[PDB]
Amino acid sequence: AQYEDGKQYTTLEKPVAGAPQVLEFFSFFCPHCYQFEEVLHISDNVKKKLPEGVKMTKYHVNFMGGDLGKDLTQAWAVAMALGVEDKVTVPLFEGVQKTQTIRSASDIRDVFINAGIKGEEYDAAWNSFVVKSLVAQQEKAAADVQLRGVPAMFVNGKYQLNPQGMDTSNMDVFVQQYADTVKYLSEK
Ligand SMILES: c1cc(-c2ccc(CNC3CCCCC3)cc2)cs1
């Protein structure tokens, strides 16, 4: 077959009922994730190839970066709660991996302040139980598949993208194959 279980994707041994249609996991510490976001724009190109109004979900993980990694999962919860993902994703990646100016929870907060989120609003969200529940949701979703590597994408709780089996000579062709694979999986 043109798409084969074991090649462009794998099938979850223990499938996850009731999971988001398209679910991505990343870490701001993760070098491929940096590329997926700023260089390849994987999430954007998958959304364009899926039906309008499809639920795409993107969650941060704790297992890279120790204390700061957990702070970033909580900061990503704040980003989701306020709806400012599109404003902080690039500066968070660059602060962790490019300039390495993010060394503390305060430095993460600075990124939100610079992006125009008011300090009182960031702090209220950071301390909110709505954000605690978003953190729990991110952890539970990752736990549902004993996740140990990012970046990772899951389709309907059943299939995991396998980018290792895609040609990487041409960035655009790679992105297109990845997105076309997500579309194929979503239609299974
Ligand atoms: C979990 C996902 C990966 C992975 C494997 C391969 C790629 C593709 N690298 C891109 C391919 C296009 C050229 C630029 C770099 C991206 C991520 C390694 S572990």
Swiss-Prot record:
Main location (coarse class): periplasm
Gene3D superfamilies referenced in this protein's UniProt entry, alphabetically: Glutaredoxin
Domain of life: Bacteria
InterPro entries recorded: DSBA-like_thioredoxin_dom, DsbA/DsbL, Thiol_disulfide_DsbA, Thioredoxin-like_sf, Thioredoxin_CS, Thioredoxin_domain
Gene Ontology CC annotations of this record: outer membrane-bounded periplasmic space
Phenotype of the disrupted gene, per the record: Induction of the PhoP/PhoQ two-component regulatory system, suppressed by 50 uM CuSO(4).
Subcellular location: Periplasm
Record flagged with keyword Translocase: no
Annotated function: Required for disulfide bond formation in some periplasmic proteins such as PhoA or OmpA. Acts by transferring its disulfide bond to other proteins and is reduced in the process. DsbA is reoxidized by DsbB. Required for pilus biogenesis. PhoP-regulated transcription is redox-sensitive, being activated when the periplasm becomes more reducing (deletion of dsbA/dsbB, treatment with dithiothreitol). MgrB acts between DsbA/DsbB and PhoP/PhoQ in this pathway.
Name this polypeptide is given: Thiol:disulfide interchange protein DsbA
Lineage of producing organism: Bacteria, Pseudomonadati, Pseudomonadota, Gammaproteobacteria, Enterobacterales
